[PDB]
Each structure stands twice: as structure tokens, then as C-alpha cells.
């Protein structure tokens, strides 16, 4: 699997592949690894499937209860701290997962959490099997002076490189841009195919 | 006579005494309209030092269930928080809040327990729940014994009986939202205009499909 | 005198006081017919704001056991939910609900416990269970002490005694379903026609082999 | 005076009050004969709606121990089920039910406990146990305090004293089964023929070596 | 073992083989691996026998209690979420099973659940020992424009390929089509033998 | 060890060998592996001796308590479901046993239960060390149009083949036929020796 | 009448009796100003042997929440320590104290519990909490039942009503800190100048952005 | 009225009754001096058979905290042992006894608990703690409710009020140790010289930096 | 990773690198390993990331609660004793971390705590992967007669040697000087780059 999250000027772009295996034997050509966790923040999944879906259900529940009790959204540092305490309260019956939670509160953030619950900020991050490839291309091409369109083009080029050079990733890429103005908006597959055919990555 | 045990004839005296405790509260009501449901609490902001809008008696249980309460306000807050975490339990377990009737039933079982056992008084609080589920718009009442009843329109509080009389006469089943909140305000008026004032009340609504919308201070005065 | 302890002569005063609490409830009854059993609850929908059909006093325990209750409605709902999960326990353990008598006996043991111990009042609720098992059609009663008795036809509620007098005179053992529900409605009439109205009642039936069928609003008025 | 604590002179008032509760029950009796033992309960099927044969007061504890009860019928059913699972425990542990006296003693210890502690009333129920073991035919009584006594013939219920007077006069120790059930019915008659009716009673027997046999409706009327 | 579940236009077809082993040593030439779990949804079994039958008993009980308490059937997402939480509450005394639950509520679904409780949707799925063969033929022949008859013919051709090329599968195939109109209907063995003799798969 | 259970027209025949070892070292030339579990159903044992005798004591107790509380016998599906739940509530301190419970309620049945509690029906079944031999001869000679005498002759021929070709089995065969008319009747050893001397299996 | 159970008409007598216990305490008050909030406790150092400054009734719960209490001083100290460790729990769990309303709600739930159960008296103590969070300046009250209300300015203690009357007349919402503490001292004066003395009171303030500042002895006498 | 529940007006009657129990005890007092603190208990050795010096009411909690008690002597010994093991807990956890105020607060929380709950009477004992910490010399009081107050000089016991009056008049803050113990003895005299005798009292002191020193029999008579 | 803490005349200087890996695969070029634990004392991290961040959250909480309850700061011996008791109450589900807590109360201190909770004082200490290098240069150049400027120059030379000769360390160095007069002050990155360019360590 592969995930990618990019913080740029006033936005954060998170995208995944959709191919779930669950065996060697790729089994599901259209999974779901990009989850909206709250009205201004999302979460991506790069580990064991069942444990991570339990994590997504729990975090949706806790952040919705939070927004209800306090009439305001949770900050990104708070949700990563919560997620880290959850993963680190049990590490000897552990969750084998690599979580990546991004979102915007007053400034965009994308935080990475390992299986031991080490929350750490970075301006771009990636997790999964085909992760060093997208770290390579994001080390070579990413600039923090990008727009949203250049950012999502960079993200699609990244996940296309990971799909070309890795067995575990693959399938149709899905991308969601979360910004403060329009909120959390997941791009439809027509615009994603449009950017794939425009950037010369289709085969 | 002085704890939840039975009467000489078939009465639970403490659960009665809780019902007269919720008769001493602030009035509130709710009603279904054509494609949703509204809750209007009277809010009678007594002093000018109270932070008018920040005290809320219409409280959200989920993005698709709301609740307005009446009676002892402390028991109210504790029970509403129990309803919140129970809705969250059903979101964790089944994936969605399929029935709002299950949500009122679990809370009402919680109230039946302290109606049932000794060493604890009953919850002296009454609530009404409102929202849409897969079935559609639902409006429930909740009683100090844990009794639930489903309504198209109901009341609670000091103006229980006067409001329920007005609703009993003048309720129309399928009703656009504007005329619905107007009918609700007329109900709240006729009862609470015995202190010869109403105030701006607080009122929330849902139409099926959308999330929750609580009015602001300016919008309710147009219907006032 | 004021908790479940014995009398100066052989009486449990609280369990009595619970029986007069279930005498204050709504009447309901049930009877076997030629190849099944029916339950008819009076439903007296008082106001027009009550969601007539959605309040149900005939509630299902399993696809092959139903129950109608009378007394305190909160204790009713809690006990009926206990019966539901107990039937589910027997489905998990043995594979099928072989005896409906076991199902009424476990619920009645649950009622005997709070008849037995201090620090808790008895369940002020009475129920009748109906359905077919491997043995055949069964109809049971359940009493605030946990007493069970098996009937061919029985009643419960405010019209206990009047209905049981009519059943005592006019019951015929093997009876087609149509004439059975007619006899049941005549029973419910003779008692409840003291407020000079009956209403449409609610009524469910099983014939052995089929699952459950609760009537709709239109069908019961043909027999009314 | 109002819970199991001692009197001003040596009496447990609640356990007394339980004994007058079991005096208010239905009469039953039992007696040994030449090579077995019988239990006859009066069954006074009051209404015609009661499913005459399916209500059973002679209940089996094992294929080699039976029991007939008198008093509060709910406490009866709970205690009889305790006796059933205790007999099953001894079958699991030792391989067979070697002594029926151990079985009555464990049940009587269970009754002594709620005679002993506060926060619980005594079991208001009395039972007699009958059956053969390795020792032979045994017939036991069981008392609301947990007192057990062994008899050749005993009674319980409303007709305790009248039946015990007839047994005290007219009992013969070694007796064929037919004349035994005849003597038992004459006992049940002389007491219960004060309402100038008896009915068909229910009666079970064992001869040592065989399993249990409860009569049918037709056979008991020959001895009636 | 092998299972197969296909979602098509307004229906879902689930079929299994019937051969249970329980040893190497095929022992039961007629088992039962296709279970109706509710009046509009069914469940198929591809793991350890005892654990899976306990799972079927529990899910029958919970869905019947659900339908009783709510007077409506459970959705398919809810039953897969329930089943995933059940399998993932205990994974260190785990259930070694691969569950596949299909059914229709307002749209047909067939969901796959692994031993760790990773629920994931797909338009056709398969589990068991002889599963890659039916994935091969369903990759080559399946179209979503099929009827019910073409669908059940595809399913029988699939399980026939798996019976021909695998040791663990075998025995008489049983198929059940669940649709919204006629509900859950399991085909009798006469029609199954008719389709086997018609499609030229009998030997 | 070896067991055998056959369902035929209105009867079920269950027979075992009697040789218990408990070591390599055959130690008891006359054990007991065929148990009457209720007045119309019986149970056979093919595992660790102590655990299985505990199982027989528990099932005798539970079915006798059942018949007492309900005034009717337990069905065969219910006793196998009960036995499966018992073996599967504890499988990490497990019972190493292979149970086979047969009996008649309104139709004859013989159900097999493994150590994990996988209850499964079959028209004839066998468990134990010398089990594939009796599966061979029951695959070659069994017909469902047999009487009781042809059935018990088939059973004795089966267990004689298993005694001839296996070390763990042996000793005097004991057979019990359970039918609805005469109930559960275990054949005396004189008739068993008569059938052995008649069928030409004595040596 | 003598434990937390309900009245003949809707009153919790023990929670009342706790409110008159907190009426017998020392007065204190608090108010928001333009960009923060202040708390002034009267401190009436009675004898000269009391270590004047080391007794503190304005106690810190966190560097961004403070509290001043009134009533039984022992229950005060225990409850304030509960508030301290609850704020620390939220710092451990979420990383920061995002809402001070959550902090007053958990403490008030703790008070509701001993309002609810038998075998424990209610907390006879009342508190006001003050501080800024992400939302901004907040000032809360807390009541022996667990009732919370949000103010712009409030009081507690023996001079509850007199101070609240002065605040009801003379409070201005947006106010510089100097004139704010002057208005607060005039409030504390008008009530407590019935013993014809005030003393130096104790007073703390926050402006949003900064941490906590409790005055010293010299600074408060300039505003005195 | 008869357990720790509230009064008709704001009083805990049992905690009062405990305060009059500690008024019935033996008097003791303590005071700070220039660089330390002293505790003087009256010891009134009544009979000649009491082992005069081996009975000690000034007991050590740590080498840097001492305590003298008054009231019920059994509750005194149990509470002082609780204080000892709590000081040891803080030595194990943090490495040193940094605050003596924490030590009096934990003990006072222990007393508040049995002030709070039913099924237990309050601790009928009062104590004063003395010693230096990192902050400096501290002298605390402890009250049957768990109330603590910090003093420069305080008393406890039968001569509470008389001693506190003398201290209220004649205490000087910074005082050499010799004149300090002289002032303390004059205080103890003026009160206890109503039986026209004092005796040799017992008295301990610390100066900041050194450990504990309890006087011997000979040294106290020089100041007597 | 590498940490360094130096006690000199009336001050204590603690500095870390900022590079977190969390894999082999250096992942975060700007982490956070230097934490202010109280207004006059700080803590450095050299172990597993998640466990150590939990430790930092707990110690911030406990020392803030301490300062609130007692109106005075905690001594350094007390915080190391507390931290040692925390790590040694659980050592069979252990924390794999090497903590180093420095600060000033009436005299400067820097204490080292291993994974087993052995608190021990030293006038300079270091933990982490690239720790023996900074022990080498602090053995060769450190004198206790230094100022604050010579001290922070020594610290930057140390961590520069560790960045040059070790794979696990790297990234931008961050330094904080804690003294009694000005309290805890963390140097801005401009002054750190100034000292790097002045000392001739930039490349």
C-alpha cells in the first residue's frame, strides 16, 4: 500500500491507492484507505486492514462526540495525541499499522503515527509499502510555494511512480484536498482521470 | 412511602415525586413537520449577567439526534451525556445510528433502573428526543419512570398541560417548516404569557437528509 | 410491611401491592384456537397526537414467541427485553427454541428474584406469552410473584375479572381463527364498553407451522 | 420482629410467618408402601380454562427422586429447579445419586441460609421428597427453616393436620401398592371433602428397581 | 473449500461446494457452508468448521434479535461491521476463518471479511482453498450486465473449474440467489443438475 | 481405536471395539467406548480417555436434566450443537477427542464432532485410529435399502476389517442398535459371537 | 426527608440543606473584564495568629484555570484537588486544556453523584471557576446539586444576594482591568461593610494570552 | 441528625459531636519561634502506676515532622500511624518530604472521607503538626471535619479557649527558644492551673537545620 | 539519535539533533527531542519515540500539578527519582528509552536515567546512538571554568562531530540553555546557524 499527505500554503492534500491484499494474491481492486475523520480533517491507513478499520471507527466516534460536547472541532495535535495514547496503551497485543492524519485548524498539518504511537509533524509524509518512492519524488519536486493544482498534480505523479515501481500498491488513485475555505472535498474520479491523462501517466 | 417500594394501592411515590419535580421546571416542546422535526425550548434568561446564548437546553446527542430537557438540570446534564456516549457506542458497534428508538430505549432503561433499585433516588428529569433515522422523523418523550411515548407533537415542563391543550386543538400533521415554528411559538406563547412576556426562545430543526441547524438570535425574533 | 418480608399471617405485602399496580393497567387477553393462538391487546389511543400504530403492546420475543403486557409500562419494556435476549441465548446454545415454557420460566425466575431479595421492589408487571413450540400451541400467564399458569384463554389488566367471566362462560376449545378473534373481541367489548367505546384493538395470531402475523389497522375493523 | 432475628423468647417470626404461608397452600401427601413410595397431590383444577394435566405439582428431580410441593408456587418452582441441578451435580461428581438424604440436605441448607441472613426473606415453601436410593425407599419433609424429617407417611398444605390425623390412626407399614393409593386417597378425601368435592388428584409411585411412573387421568379415577 | 459471491444488477448469487475435511482424508461428502443469516442476506464459510458454525449461530441470533427490536432488517454494512468487531475483539485466541456475507437492502452487496476482521466491499468475491481458480474465471467472463440466469451459469462454471483443479473442494454444488423481489431463494438440486448437464460440465 | 455409526431406514447402528491404550502397550482388553447418552440416543468415543469420560458424564447429566425439565427427549441437532459449543468454549486448553453421537427423534441421525466442535451430519460416519478401513468397506458395501440385520452384519464386517488391519483397535466388538420402536438396545455378546461365526470372520 | 430522596412536592432536602450550608460561608465573587477575568475572595483574617497570606481561597487548578470556593472548607479542598487532577488528566489525554467548560462539567458530575446516591451526603460546597481557553474568557458557577451556570459576573457565600444586587445594577461588560477590580471591590464593600470593616481582600486576574497573576499584599491596598 | 447528613440549617451534627469529643480531651499547644517550632503537651500523669515518660502524646511522624494530638486516644494513635506511613510514601516516591502541608492535607483528606460517607463515624480527634520543610517552619491544626489552618501558635484540648486567649494577647512573632518555651508554659499554666497544679509537661522543639529533640524530665522543670 | 547535557558554573546546556527514524529510512528531518519539562528544568529523549513522548506528557503533567499544589518548583533529584520509579514499576513490559533530565534549583544538575531506571548524576552526560563521539570530545575539551558561550560552542562542536560520524543522528541542531537568572531559554535557529558558521563546522 501507499499513502501520501502534503501540507502546502493553506491546504493539505491526502491521497491513497486502492488495492487491498489481505493475502499475496491481490484480492480487492477497489478498497478504501482514505477516510474523512472530521469535517476539517482526514486519516489515511497503511497497515493491517481490520485493526485500522477499527481505529477509523473509534476516531470518527470520538471526534464526533468531541465536536458535539464542545461545539468546535478538535485540533490536529489533539487528535494525534489521542491516537498515540490509544496505540500506546496496548503495544504488547499491538496494532500493526502506520497511520497518517492530516487536517487544518488555523494552519495546515499532517502528522505521522507509527505502530508504537510516535506522533511527529512533517510538512509532507508517506506511509505504506510503496512509500520510499513517493518520498523520493517529493524530495525532488516538492516546493512549499505551490498552489492546490500543482500540489495535486505532484501527488498524482508520486502515487503513479509508486504504482509503477511496486507490487503491493496499485488500483485507482483517490485524492482528497482539505482546505479551510471549502472544507474537506474529495475529488471525483473524472477529474483524477483527467489529471492522469493530462500529466502523461496513463498506460 | 419514602423509597421506591410500592404504595398501599399501586403507586411509586418517589417516581411521582420526581414527576412533580419535573413539573417545576422550564417548559419546552417539539413537533414534527412535513419532512422533519423541531424542538423549541423556552429560554427565559432571567438576569442580564447570564451568558444568554451559551446556556443551551437544546443539546445535540448526535448529528442526527437532538434532545431538549426539563426538570433538575444536573440530572439533565448527566443523562444527556449518557445518551451521547450511548449513541457513540452504537456508531462504534453497528456503523450508524439506525434507530433513534433504540437510543431513547437505552436511556429509559437507565432511568428504569434507578426507579427499580433501593439506595438511589429516581432521575428527576424528563426529556424529549427528536431526529430522523432510516425510518424517518421521530419525536419521543421520556418520563421519570423510564416511560417512553412517541408523538407527532409534545411538551414538557411547567407549561406541560396548557401547551398540550393548544397542541391537542390546533395541530396539523403535514406542515411547512415556517408555519410549524409559528404554531410552536403560538403554543409556547399561550402558556408562558402568564408572566406577560415570553422572550426570544431557542429552537432547532431538521429536515430529512440534512444535518442539524440551531437558529441564531436574529432568526427566531422574526417568528416571534 | 414495607418490603418483601412476610406478613403477620402469610402474605407478601409488596407483591400484593404490585398486583394492584397491574390491576391499574390496560386490559389485554389471549386465547388458543384450533391450530394456533391469538393475543388481543386493547389499545386505547387517548390523544390524537400519539403515533397510533407505532406504540405496540403486543411485542415479539422471537419469530415463534410473542408477548402482551400490562401494568407499569417501563418494567414491562425492560422485562420483555430480558425475555428477548433469553430466547436468543437458547437459540445460541441449543439451536432452536424447543420449549416456550422454559422461556416463561426463566423470566418468571427473574421476577421471583426481586420478589425474594431486599433492596429492590418486585416487578410490577404482568404478561401473557403465546406461541407454538415442538409441543404445540401454548399460552402462559406471568404474575408479579413469578407465578406462571397455562391457559387455553386468559386475560390481564383492568378488565381482568369481567373478561375472565365472559371467557369462563363462552369459550369453546377448538375454534376456527375468525370465530376465535370474534369471541375475543366480544370479550374485550363487554368489559371495556363501560366507557361506552372500545376502539380498534391490536391483535396478533399464529397458526402452527407459519411465522407471526400482526394485523393491520384495516383488518381488525372488519371484526370490530 | 420484622426480619430473621430472634424473638423476646426464642422464636424466628419470619420463619413462623413462612410456615403460615405454607399452611395457606394446596394439600398434598405421600407414603411408603411395601417396596416403594407414592406421592399424591390434590390437584383442584378450579376453572375450565386451566390446561388440567399440564400444570404439574409432582415434579421430577431425577429419574430416581421426585418431589411434591406446597406453599408459594414461585418459590416452589425455583427451589425445585435448585434440587434438579444439585442432583445433576452429584451425578457429574460421584457417578450416581447414592443418597436421596444428601439431596434433601443440600436443598434444606439452601433454605437455612435465607432463614439465617438479613436482606432476604425465608423461602415460604414446604416440600416432600420421595424415592429409592441404595438404602431403599425414603420419604422426606422440608420446612421453611430447612428442617428435614424422615417419614413413612406425611402430609403438607391446607390439609396438613386432618390428613396427618388420619395417617396417624390408619397407616399400615407394609402395604401393596393398590391398597396404598386407596389409603392415600381416603386420607386426601377426609380432609378435602369439606368443599364437598375432591376431584381427580395426581399421584406418582415407584417400586424399588423400576423408574418413575406418573399415572394418567384415567387410572386415578378407578381408585377415586 | 471454495465459496463464491457475485453482485449483479439487482441480485446477489452465492454458492459453495459441499465437502468438509476436518482431516486430509475427505470425510463428509455433503456438508453445509451456505447459510441464510437473515430474510434478505446470507453468509458463506471458508475456514475452520467449528469456529465458523459458532459464528453462524451467533450472527443468526444477533440479526434475529435486531429484526425483532427494530422491525426492519439490518443493512449489509452493519452486519459486516458487527462481524468485523466480533472477529477483532479476539485475535490472539483467534478465529481462523474467511467469511463472506452477501445480501441486498436497497442495493446488492457482497462483503469479504478475513480472519482479522477487515471488512471490504467488492462486486464479486471468493474465499477458500480453491479460490484463485474462481477468481480467474470471474476475471475472464464476468460482466455486470448479466441477468440472474447468466449469473448462476457463471457461478456453476466457476465452482466446476475449482472442483476440477483442486483437491480440497468437491462434492455437490449448492447455490442460493438472493434478490429483493422473491427474497432469499436457494435453488433445488434438480435445477443445479440441470444447469450442470446443460453447460457441459458433467462427467 | 475405531467407532462406526450407520443411519439406515428407521434405525441407527453404532458399534465400537473394546481395547484401551492409554500407553503403547495395550492395557485394557475390555474397555467401554459405546455410551447410551439418553433413552433414544447414544454417543461413541475416539479420543483421550479421561477427557472423553468427563464429556460422557456431562452429557448424560445435561440430557437427563433436559428430559426432566421438558418431559420430552432432546433432538439430535440440539445435542450436537450443545456438544459443539462445549468443545469450542475451550479450545486453547483443548479436548483432544473425536465424538460421534447418533440417535433417532423423528428421523435417524448420526453426527460427527471433531476436537474443535465442528458438528456435521452424515448418513454413516466413523472416528478413531482404525477409521479409514471402515470408511473403505462402508464406501464399498453400504446401501441405504438395508434392514437392521444386514446393517449390523455390515458393521461387524467393518470393525473386523479394522481389527485385522490396525494395531490400536482390537478386542471384543460391542454393538448397539437404536430404533424408535424398541428404543436403545445393545446386543448381547452371544449374538455378536453368533454373527462373527456366521459371517466367517472368526479366527 | 433525611437523605437524598424526593420531597412531598419536588425538592431534594439534603441538597437544599447543603445550599444553606454554603450560605453560611465566606463571600467571594468574580467578573469578566475586557480581555480577561478576575476573582476576588474576601479574606477576613480573624485572629493575628493566622498566617495571613498562606491561607489561600483562590487556588489554581492549572496555569490556565483558577477557582475560588465557599462553604465547608474541607469539602472545598477535596473537590478542588479533584478538579486539579482532572485538568491534569485532560492534559495527558488531549495535550491541552481546550475547554474550561469540560473541566467544570466533570467536577459538577462528581457533585451530582453524591446528590444522586444514598449512603453519602452531598458536597456542601460552591465554587466559581475562571480562566481563558481557546474560546476565550469564561466564568462558571457550581452549586451543591452540580448545577453550573455561566456568568459575566457572579458571587458566592454569605454576601451572595447583596453582591449580586450590586452587580445586577452596576456591571459594565467591557471594562479595563483597573476599573474592573475597583468595581469588584465596591461590590465586596457594600455587602461586607455590615461589620463596618472590609480588610485587604485577595484577588487574581488573567488577561487572555498571559498566565496567572495573584496580587501581593501591597497592590490590593491601592485599590482598597 | 444521627449520621453525617445535613441539618435543618447547614450543620453536620456528628462532626459537631466529634468537636465536643475533642473538647473533652487533654490540652496541648504549639508555637513557632525565631528559627523553629515547639510543641508542648500537658502531660497530667494521674496515678503513680502509669509509666510516666513512656506514654508519649508528642509523637514523631518523620525526623522532620512531629505531631501532638488531643481527643479520643485510639483514633489518635490510628491517625498518627496513617500520617507516619504517608510520610514514608512520600519519601519513597519523591525522595524527600518537601512539603509538610502536603502531609497534613493527606491526613485531613482521610478525615474528610469519614466526615463524608455513611456507615462510619467521623474521626473524633484533633491534631497539630509542627516542623520545618524546604519552605521553613510550619505549624498546622487539624479538625474533625478535616479542616486545616496554619498558625504561628495554636492550642487544642480542654484548654483550647483559655490558652488561645493568652496566645492572642501575649504572642511575639520572633522569639528565642528559651523565652518561647517560657511563654508556652505560662500559657499552659494559666489554663490548667484551675486544678491548682500543672505538672511537668512534655515539650519538643526544632530549629531549622537540625533534627528532632524531645526534652528529658530534668530540663522541662528548669522552665517550669 | 544524540543528546548532550552539560552542567557548568551556574547553568546547564542541553541540546539535541532533530532527525527521527522510526525506520532505517530516515523519515522526519525535523523532529523534537528537547522538551521543557518545567519552568526551570528540561528533558531530552533518546529512545523509542512513542514511549518517550508518553513519558514527556506524563512528566509535564506531574510537575505542573506539583508546582500548583506546592507553589514551588520540584528539585532535580525529586524529578529523577520520580522518573526512575516510573520506569522501574514496569520493566517486564518495559520502556526502551534513555532519558536525560537537566535543570537548576539552587545548583545546576544533569541526571541520566537508563531504561531500568538507574538515576545517576554527572557533570556532563549524553545518550543516544551517536553518544560516544560527544563523550569523546567532551572528554577532550570540556572544562568546568567555562562561560555560557564557550559551553554552547562546545555543545555545537560535539553534536557536529556526532552528525559527521554517525548515520542515525543529523538534521538541524537545537539547543536550550537553562540558567537561574533568565530561566529556560531555547536559542533561536538564527543564533545556532551563526555559531555553526562562526566555528567553521558548516558544509
Write up this protein.
This is part of a larger assembly, with four copies of chain A (203 residues) and five copies of chain B (224 residues). Chain A is an alpha+beta fold and 203 residues long. Chain A is built from five helices and ten strands, in the order E-E-E-E-H-H-E-E-E-E-H-H-E-E-H. In chain A, the strands form two sheets. Chain A has a five-stranded antiparallel β-sheet. In chain A, strands 3-4-5-6-7 form a five-stranded antiparallel β-sheet. Chain B has one domain. Chain B has six helices and ten strands; from the N terminus they run H-E-E-E-E-H-H-E-E-E-E-H-H-E-E-H. In chain B, strands 8-1-2-9-10 form a five-stranded antiparallel β-sheet, covered by helices on one side. Chain B has a five-stranded antiparallel β-sheet with strand order 3-4-5-6-7. The longest helix of chain B has 22 residues. The termini of chain B are far apart. In chain B, 55% of the residues are buried. Chains in contact: A-B, A-E, A-G, A-I, B-C, B-E, B-G, C-D, C-E, C-F, D-F, E-F, G-H, G-I, H-I. At the B-G interface, helix 1 and helix 2 of B face helix 3, strand 7 and helix 4 of G. Chains B, C, D, G, H: It comes from Thermoplasma acidophilum (strain ATCC 25905 / DSM 1728 / JCM 9062 / NBRC 15155 / AMRC-C165). Chains B, C, D, G, H: Keywords: Cytoplasm, Proteasome. Chains B, C, D, G, H: InterPro entries: Ntn_hydrolases_N, Proteasome_alpha, Proteasome_alpha-type, Proteasome_asu_arc, Proteasome_asu_N, Proteasome_sua/b.
Alpha carbon gap, first and last residue of chain B? 45 Å
Major beta sheet summary of chain B: 5 strands, antiparallel
Largest sheet report of chain A: 5 strands, antiparallel
Through-space gap between termini of chain A:
20 Å
Radius of gyration of chain B: 17 Å
The SS-based structural class of chain A is alpha+beta
Which terms would index this structure?
part of a larger assembly; 9 chains; A: 203 residues; alpha+beta; five-stranded antiparallel beta sheet; 5 helices; 10 strands; globular; B: 224 residues; 37% helix; hydrolase; proteasome
Amino acid at each position: 500500500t501507499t499513502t501520501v499527505g502534503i501540507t502546502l500554503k493553506d491546504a493539505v492534500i491526502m491521497a491513497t491507492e486502492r488495492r487491498v491484499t489481505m493475502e499475496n494474491f491481490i484480492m480487492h481492486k477497489n478498497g478504501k484507505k482514505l477516510f474523512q475523520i472530521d469535517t476539517y480533517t482526514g486519516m489515511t491507513i497503511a497497515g493491517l486492514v481490520g485493526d485500522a478499520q477499527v481505529l477509523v471507527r473509534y476516531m470518527k466516534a470520538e471526534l464526533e462526540l468531541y465536536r458535539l460536547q464542545r461545539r468546535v472541532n478538535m485540533p490536529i495535535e489533539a487528535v494525534a495525541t489521542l491516537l498515540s495514547n490509544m496505540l500506546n496503551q496496548v503495544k504488547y497485543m499491538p496494532y500493526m499499522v502506520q497511520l497518517l492524519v492530516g487536517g487544518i485548524d488555523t494552519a495546515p498539518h499532517v502528522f505521522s503515527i507509527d505502530a508504537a504511537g510516535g506522533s511527529v509533524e512533517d510538512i509532507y509524509a508517506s506511509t505504506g509499502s510503496g512509500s520510499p518512492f513517493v518520498y523520493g519524488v517529493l524530495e525532488s519536486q516538492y516546493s512549499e510555494k505551490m498552489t492546490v493544482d500543482e500540489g495535486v498534480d505532484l501527488v498524482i505523479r508520486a502515487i503513479s511512480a509508486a504504482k509503477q515501481r511496486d507490487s503491493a500498491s496499485g488500483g485507482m488513485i483517490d485524492v482528497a484536498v482539505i482546505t479551510r475555505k471549502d472544507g474537506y472535498v474529495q475529488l471525483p474520479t473524472d477529474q483524477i482521470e483527467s489529471r492522469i491523462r493530462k500529466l502523461g501517466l496513463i498506460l | 412511602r419514602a423509597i421506591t417500594v410500592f404504595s398501599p394501592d399501586g403507586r411509586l411515590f418517589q417516581v411521582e415525586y420526581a414527576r412533580e419535580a419535573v413539573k417545576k421546571g422550564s417548559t419546552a416542546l417539539g413537533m414534527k413537520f412535513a419532512n422533519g422535526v423541531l424542538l423549541i425550548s423556552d429560554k427565559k434568561v432571567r438576569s442580564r449577567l447570564i451568558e444568554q446564548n451559551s446556556i443551551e437546553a437544546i443539546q445535540l446527542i448526535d448529528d442526527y439526534v437532538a434532545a431538549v430537557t426539563s426538570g433538575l438540570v444536573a440530572d439533565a446534564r448527566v443523562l444527556v451525556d449518557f445518551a451521547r456516549i450511548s449513541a457513540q457506542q452504537e456508531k462504534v458497534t453497528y456503523g450508524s445510528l439506525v434507530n433513534i428508538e433504540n437510543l431513547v430505549k437505552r436511556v429509559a432503561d437507565q432511568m428504569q433502573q434507578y426507579t427499580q433499585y433501593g439506595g438511589v433516588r429516581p432521575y428527576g428529569v424528563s426529556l424529549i428526543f427528536a431526529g430522523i433515522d432510516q425510518i424517518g422523523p421521530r419525536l419521543f418523550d421520556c418520563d421519570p419512570a423510564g416511560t417512553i411515548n412517541e408523538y407527532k407533537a409534545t411538551a414538557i415542563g411547567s407549561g406541560k398541560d396548557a401547551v398540550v391543550s393548544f397542541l391537542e386543538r390546533e395541530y396539523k400533521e403535514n406542515l411547512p417548516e415556517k408555519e410549524a415554528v409559528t404554531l410552536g411559538i403560538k403554543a409556547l406563547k399561550s402558556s408562558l404569557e402568564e408572566g406577560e412576556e415570553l422572550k426570544a426562545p431557542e429552537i432547532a430543526s431538521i429536515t430529512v437528509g440534512n444535518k442539524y441547524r440551531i437558529y441564531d438570535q436574529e432568526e427566531v425574533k422574526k417568528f416571534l
